[PDB]
Amino acid sequence: SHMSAEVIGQVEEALDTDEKEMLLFLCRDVAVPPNVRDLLDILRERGKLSVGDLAELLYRVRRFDLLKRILKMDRKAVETHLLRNPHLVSDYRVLMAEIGEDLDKSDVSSLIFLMKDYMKEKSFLDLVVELEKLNLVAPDQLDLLEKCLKNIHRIDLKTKIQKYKQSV
Amino acid sequence: MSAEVIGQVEEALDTDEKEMLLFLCRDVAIDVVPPNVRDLLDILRERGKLSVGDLAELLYRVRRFDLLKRILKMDRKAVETHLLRNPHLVSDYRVLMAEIGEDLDKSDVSSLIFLMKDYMGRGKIEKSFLDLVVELEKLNLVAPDQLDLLEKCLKNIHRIDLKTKIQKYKQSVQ
Amino acid sequence: SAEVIGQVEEALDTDEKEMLLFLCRDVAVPPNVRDLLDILRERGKLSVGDLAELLYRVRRFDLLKRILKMDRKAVETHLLRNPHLVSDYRVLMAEIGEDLDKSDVSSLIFLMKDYMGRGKKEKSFLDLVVELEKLNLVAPDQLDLLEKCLKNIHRIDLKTKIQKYKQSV
Amino acid sequence: HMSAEVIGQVEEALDTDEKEMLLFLCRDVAIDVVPPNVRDLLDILRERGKLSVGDLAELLYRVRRFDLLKRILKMDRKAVETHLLRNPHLVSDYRVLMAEIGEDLDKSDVSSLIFLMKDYMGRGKISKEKSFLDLVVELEKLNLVAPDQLDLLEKCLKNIHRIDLKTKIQKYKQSVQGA
Amino acid sequence: MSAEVIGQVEEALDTDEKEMLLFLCRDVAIDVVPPNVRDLLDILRERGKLSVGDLAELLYRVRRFDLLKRILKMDRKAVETHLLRNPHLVSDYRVLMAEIGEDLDKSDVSSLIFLMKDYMGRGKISKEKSFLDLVVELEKLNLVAPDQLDLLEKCLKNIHRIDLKTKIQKYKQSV
Amino acid sequence: MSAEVIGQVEEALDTDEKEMLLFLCRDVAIDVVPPNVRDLLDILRERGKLSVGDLAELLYRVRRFDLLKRILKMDRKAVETHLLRNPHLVSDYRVLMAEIGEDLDKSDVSSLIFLMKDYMGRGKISKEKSFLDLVVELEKLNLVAPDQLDLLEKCLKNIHRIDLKTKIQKYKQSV
Amino acid sequence: MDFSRNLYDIGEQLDSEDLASLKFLSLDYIPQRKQEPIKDALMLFQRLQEKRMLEESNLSFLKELLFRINRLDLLITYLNTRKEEMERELQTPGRAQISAYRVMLYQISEEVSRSELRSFKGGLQEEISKCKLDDDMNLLDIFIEMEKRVILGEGKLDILKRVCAQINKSLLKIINDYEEFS
Amino acid sequence: MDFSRNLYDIGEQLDSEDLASLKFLSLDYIPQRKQEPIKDALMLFQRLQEKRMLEESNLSFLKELLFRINRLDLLITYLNTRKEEMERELQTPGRAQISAYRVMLYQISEEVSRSELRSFKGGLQEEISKCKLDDDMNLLDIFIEMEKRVILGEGKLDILKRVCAQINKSLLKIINDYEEFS
Amino acid sequence: MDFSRNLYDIGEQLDSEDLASLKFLSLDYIPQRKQEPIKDALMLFQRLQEKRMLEESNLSFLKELLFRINRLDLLITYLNTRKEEMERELQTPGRAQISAYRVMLYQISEEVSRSELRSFKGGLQEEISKCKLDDDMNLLDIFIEMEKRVILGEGKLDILKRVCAQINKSLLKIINDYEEFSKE
Amino acid sequence: DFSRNLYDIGEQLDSEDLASLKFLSLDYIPQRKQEPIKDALMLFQRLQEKRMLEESNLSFLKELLFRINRLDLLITYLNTRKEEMERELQTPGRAQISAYRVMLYQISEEVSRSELRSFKGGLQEEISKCKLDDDMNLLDIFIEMEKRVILGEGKLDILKRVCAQINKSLLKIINDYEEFSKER
Ligand SMILES: [Se]
């Protein structure tokens, strides 16, 4: 019921590298913290890390075990909180992480090869950050990403993008 | 419990035995995910949960009876007595998961993942069975008192024998 | 002599000198070790046993043998036979600090921030204890907060050492 | 004392089966560690003081590479056998016996042996081809076979109608009880 | 010789070589503790212990033969002759320690640090510590000394480095 | 030419290309040991050894002709004209070492490092390091040099790379 | 016309066997250390881009490669080039960037079956008596190893001719045609 | 309807030869680089899902594949579709996703026996290299090679007709029926 | 009696033709993808064990398989079971696990000789592709192909009847006995 | 040299000798291992694995060569006269090939091709038609009858009834075997 530094420490120690990396990506609009413990502490200091906010973050990185063990909440409670309050993480960020999860290293390599004209071991989220820095992708600017996903024959992910666009 | 014994054990185990040992100890070091087995055993030692009996139970669960005999000078029956008389470091649930994982080959794991990815909302991700169990636990989709989804998926890939093992565990609990 | 003070001063490294200053905080606050040792000498409190106890607490047994020509056992016997210059509380703090790695200290500092704020980058455990003492958050008769913090970083063994200290008084 | 050049010549001259045999034969000399490959094994033997000229000669004799004995170490069969008569062996007779049995078993025989032994071993389902030496290693890990504990292996070799290999075991036991 | 050479040496050596140079001179710089190698070399020079022969011995021990040739115009033969014909600045004990350290790989060093945790606290052990740091920490605890090597022999035996244990035994024989 | 061009060059190279660049400039930047490629290029610029032709030679040595065109607006023939008409920043010896390294795969480099552990400690060089790291360690021990290649020829012969021994012998006869 | 997309499509039409052939035919321009991690055509193409042997205004080496591995479908479909054009381009002296020696070798590998390959390995186990050959090697890997031991080269065909003579005579015909054209 | 379970069951009824046929019939949608690692039906299905050519609400391409390899048992058992429906569906213009050219080739492969396959390989000995005419090549792989050398295509049936006319005339019947339909 | 050893011994008495027959009689329980790599009886047994159709306390399906391929020698020697017992067992309603249809097909294959198999392939020329009529194909493989094209099934016997009638009259007798018995 | 001698003996044995040798070894080499045996050396190799053939134990090989009437090989490669074998094998308990197996073999040696046709005709309702095909010899037919437990040491009725219809010398072989096996 109360936020403390104990909860932040538990959460930070339980997440692995990929979950931490994604959590940093999902919070880029509420920002740039170098690690997750600093990110959560800054969010707490600004009054944006109540139990519900942290539960939303754990729900987005799909650590339901941490939801149940640390915050004593279940799936339906987090979904209620989300359907009742404004979201800390936008649908755009959730969509970008989802696309990243459905891509393997060969897919990301092929995607990078096609997009280098318009702009290693880098993940999809790193590429999205780099493209945002070049103003080549944005919540209202997805045609280039959609075209590149189509050209590497990932029509399913293009469809996820089209569902997002029809959602706005 | 010295560091020479821990070093001996760490150097003697192969990759699969080490990965299994990390999986079997997830309920004892619930907070920390240790990156290797030397750190895991060191953490267990500092928290007072790595007596000779504890290390013997761990070696018994990864079926390294040679290490039991050579390092601790114990046989199977002595460890079984210790287990029959003392609380266990590793639960029957973890033991069952590891046993199921031994009875599955790579083709079986691929079929299982194909069926289960629909309930996990998982991405396009070779995973062993124990990796899949960890991923299912993080999603709260499998637990000692929550085995129906796993039992159903094992039945649907025609591993009726493993479904029987799960049902025998369930009745052993009640 | 006064030359031995110079020898010990130059033989200790930064962390050992910082610990030496921490261990002597209860005596009637010096900025460096030469001044601490000169003050102890001025008061007649830098006998062979006093210097031996100090070198033993910062675990410089090499200096014990080379400067005072004695060993660990002689110092431990002397400590069992005479009153101590450094209290068991300071010794307890120093040992807790010596059993913590950098990540544990970072986690402890992060937990305490709710009570003491930011403070002064590379902070040691003993610096944290000093800043907690200045804010009256820890004391020989007030250790429960430190116990909570040690328990939350999964170091129950150090909480047990604190509890044994509590039972010794 | 043994040069990296000699170790490299040996390693490059051996094939996959002889390399796996060499790894098996030295399991007792370096019990504590499983070397990934032959070069690392021989380096480990140098670090442990177990790789003199005679040690390497014995290892080459065990994998029956007299060509390598002559070319690399300028030695023949008689010199290494005289050395083995007058010095303690790196490789026990038990391991020599295991390797010799394994040479006479094909993969079908090994899968038949595994099928018979699964329930003794509490083994899972492993869809990878296994040699007889790999099975020996698994059995050793379960304390189900040892120089003084050969009855289970004997019975199972009999059950797959390899009386000849069982007889090799019987001769090993008679040779041990003679000395 | 000049301070220009001291600057050359300090600039050309890397971090591990500097750390080793500090370790090798711990018995010469007893009355001081130098914080870096520039100060160590200045202290050695002011005390008359940084002649051409001394610098050659030091560079030979940190195995910088390129610097030997470039700065002093010496190869291994001349330095070994000088060492056979003159007293050594660095004791055989320190040379033994440094050679053992340079014959250990990172897995061996990790295993050694882990085994020595049974003789000191966690704050003194760190993942990225060299063998020489461990030797210094053991010296501070009087757990290793030129005439006190059994603990180090036991630890080297427990990580199966019988060759280095034999090097220690040869050293003990030579004293 | 500016710090922006240097920034472009640094951003465009990968880890192996950067490490190679540091190796090729060891005879030019011998006044100091640069820690990374930014500082190396800055020092070469301040010492008058990074004109457009010099940087083009460096990019030509790592065979990044695409970078030649994109950053300096040059092709191979202009760079070869510059090399035929001006002194070379990189000696033929360094070029030879780099070429040998580029014709060696992971297994050959592993075998070479193993053969060199008879000439140096096990802790001096990790198993996975590159051929250029190995040659650097050999240079520090004065075991390989422009006029001292017999040991390298012997090791290349022992791993059955007679082609690389032939490259070395061509280099020798060219002098 | 999107250059990178066309390169990606061409790469998608090439499997691991085609890629091994392309890597062999590029051995004189991409050395072994850079060859080892190349596991798809794009990586290969990208290296060719770094040497400026492949760019939007210079498709010559790509066309030559695709022609030499008999991927005329890719030539016509993605590069609008027919077989005759290539044939008249590569006969003009000075335009073929893949040496006749390399091409020759590749063509020999195109005519050797599996049994012929095993007999080839046996004969070369004969010539190199101090080293076991790997059991999975194809003929191109064998040629690369022979080049490494300088028992095969533009002016050293003795061992190749002998081993091929003990296998089939058309291989010798290929070798002799190569020799006579030079 | 459990969709993934149903796809898994269908995959369990398809062996390596059916899979080779399915991959051949999918060549115009799954290129060679992605074809190579496909070793069971599920992997094939996954690729089809990524192109949105296979989902619970879109079974048409899967049904067409199963119909063209004559797995009517699977059509009826797992997809509740009879032979007549498929025929109707695939005869409506614009509904068939497998080209008539591809189908035709597959059907030719259905009618060539082993001896005729060796005679076919003999007839192509001047257009294909011997490594690609080895004994371990089936007719579909030969067709893929011919396509790669542009001696076989939608508008180039000359060599196919010439070779088939020396084998059996039912092959010519298949080719001519295809030609008259197009 | 050791269960695994007894299974191994039974397997050593079964050659590749017996194994083909056992795989055919098991078609309704082991799908084609799993059928392809089965090259000895032990692999077959493993499949039956994973579905719990073969275990130490349940030998019924193994006994039924061995009885249907007329290996009464193995039944009596390794399973201590006489012909009459099996007859009494498989006549109990609900007890047979191999369908009468599958057995019927197997029985037809026991009555078709080499030349008759060639004539069968000849009779199927317009329903089966020429590749699946190759000389290496046995009759069981042909039946599997017909089933895949749903021109053969429990309620689809017309083509089988036509071809067998042009082969021999006793084949029709087998088919007709099955058809009359299977309405119960 | 034992291995060279085995190789030479195998080189002197044709395919008919090999079929006879495989039949006479039926009680020691099971069907799965019988299938790939296509030369005599392989057969001898299986016997070596069972410890029934080694340099110090040639008795089973001698008995085999004696029962298939290769007395030339017996004398030439094994230094054994016909009489010695007759002196060893007439004492009960010394033969490793059962008198029942030998008897069956002798029946097949006395049956001509036409008589084989009549035998197949006589067995039409006991064995499937495919096991009575033109490619079957009498030894294979006996193996099939054994698999169906209509032929064995205690089941000679069908064999007797069939042989009595062809020739009385066959019935004499059977009855001599039966009467000699009742003497103890
Ligand atoms: Se003192």
Tab-separated table of C-alpha atoms in Angstrom, chain I residues 94-183:
chain	number	residue	atom	x	y	z
I	94	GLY	CA	-15.026	-53.733	-26.598
I	95	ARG	CA	-11.648	-55.389	-26.039
I	96	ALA	CA	-9.857	-55.273	-29.394
I	97	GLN	CA	-7.850	-52.104	-29.920
I	98	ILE	CA	-6.854	-52.781	-33.537
I	99	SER	CA	-9.938	-52.126	-35.665
I	100	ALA	CA	-11.410	-55.006	-37.643
I	101	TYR	CA	-10.905	-52.818	-40.733
I	102	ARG	CA	-7.140	-52.487	-40.173
I	103	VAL	CA	-6.810	-56.236	-39.533
I	104	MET	CA	-8.850	-56.926	-42.688
I	105	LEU	CA	-6.425	-54.854	-44.747
I	106	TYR	CA	-3.453	-56.624	-43.197
I	107	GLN	CA	-5.068	-59.966	-43.969
I	108	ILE	CA	-5.518	-59.016	-47.624
I	109	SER	CA	-1.822	-58.186	-47.802
I	110	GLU	CA	-1.061	-61.699	-46.495
I	111	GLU	CA	-2.917	-63.202	-49.491
I	112	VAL	CA	-1.403	-61.045	-52.269
I	113	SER	CA	1.693	-62.490	-53.942
I	114	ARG	CA	4.432	-60.659	-55.840
I	115	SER	CA	2.851	-60.955	-59.299
I	116	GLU	CA	-0.575	-60.191	-57.860
I	117	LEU	CA	0.921	-57.068	-56.247
I	118	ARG	CA	2.070	-55.984	-59.708
I	119	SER	CA	-1.468	-56.609	-61.015
I	120	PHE	CA	-2.915	-54.602	-58.091
I	121	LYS	CA	-0.665	-51.659	-58.956
I	122	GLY	CA	-1.816	-52.054	-62.555
I	123	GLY	CA	-5.461	-51.940	-61.480
I	124	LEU	CA	-4.918	-48.686	-59.555
I	125	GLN	CA	-3.424	-46.752	-62.496
I	126	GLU	CA	-6.064	-44.003	-62.704
I	127	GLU	CA	-6.457	-43.379	-58.955
I	128	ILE	CA	-2.834	-43.329	-57.718
I	129	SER	CA	0.034	-41.353	-59.223
I	130	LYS	CA	2.662	-43.389	-61.030
I	131	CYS	CA	5.330	-42.611	-58.402
I	132	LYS	CA	3.335	-44.276	-55.628
I	133	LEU	CA	2.934	-47.375	-57.839
I	134	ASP	CA	6.681	-48.042	-58.073
I	135	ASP	CA	7.988	-51.597	-57.749
I	136	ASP	CA	9.491	-51.000	-54.279
I	137	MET	CA	5.997	-50.293	-52.848
I	138	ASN	CA	4.358	-53.116	-50.892
I	139	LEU	CA	0.602	-53.494	-50.537
I	140	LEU	CA	0.480	-51.816	-47.111
I	141	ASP	CA	2.112	-48.686	-48.546
I	142	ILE	CA	-0.470	-48.714	-51.349
I	143	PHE	CA	-3.289	-48.910	-48.796
I	144	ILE	CA	-1.817	-45.949	-46.923
I	145	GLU	CA	-1.724	-43.955	-50.172
I	146	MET	CA	-5.357	-44.857	-50.975
I	147	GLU	CA	-6.384	-43.790	-47.486
I	148	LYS	CA	-4.591	-40.482	-47.957
I	149	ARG	CA	-6.653	-39.956	-51.132
I	150	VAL	CA	-9.836	-41.141	-49.275
I	151	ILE	CA	-10.482	-43.787	-51.936
I	152	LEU	CA	-10.202	-46.427	-49.201
I	153	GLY	CA	-11.820	-46.375	-45.773
I	154	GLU	CA	-14.153	-48.204	-43.447
I	155	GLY	CA	-17.118	-47.089	-45.566
I	156	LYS	CA	-15.228	-46.816	-48.879
I	157	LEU	CA	-14.516	-50.323	-50.186
I	158	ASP	CA	-15.613	-50.052	-53.839
I	159	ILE	CA	-12.187	-49.611	-55.425
I	160	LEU	CA	-10.673	-52.275	-53.169
I	161	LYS	CA	-13.488	-54.665	-54.133
I	162	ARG	CA	-13.073	-53.960	-57.860
I	163	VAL	CA	-9.305	-54.502	-57.883
I	164	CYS	CA	-9.450	-57.581	-55.655
I	165	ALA	CA	-12.239	-59.079	-57.788
I	166	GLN	CA	-9.971	-58.777	-60.797
I	167	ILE	CA	-7.176	-60.374	-58.706
I	168	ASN	CA	-8.817	-63.319	-56.927
I	169	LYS	CA	-12.156	-64.407	-55.438
I	170	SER	CA	-10.764	-65.275	-51.980
I	171	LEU	CA	-9.825	-61.613	-51.494
I	172	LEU	CA	-13.475	-60.693	-52.019
I	173	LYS	CA	-14.377	-63.334	-49.456
I	174	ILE	CA	-12.099	-61.650	-46.894
I	175	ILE	CA	-13.595	-58.226	-47.680
I	176	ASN	CA	-17.178	-59.524	-47.517
I	177	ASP	CA	-16.636	-61.370	-44.227
I	178	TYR	CA	-15.286	-58.134	-42.758
I	179	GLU	CA	-18.223	-56.130	-44.137
I	180	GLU	CA	-20.810	-58.550	-42.726
I	181	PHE	CA	-19.121	-58.788	-39.325
I	182	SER	CA	-18.563	-55.029	-38.910
I	183	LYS	CA	-22.231	-54.024	-38.648
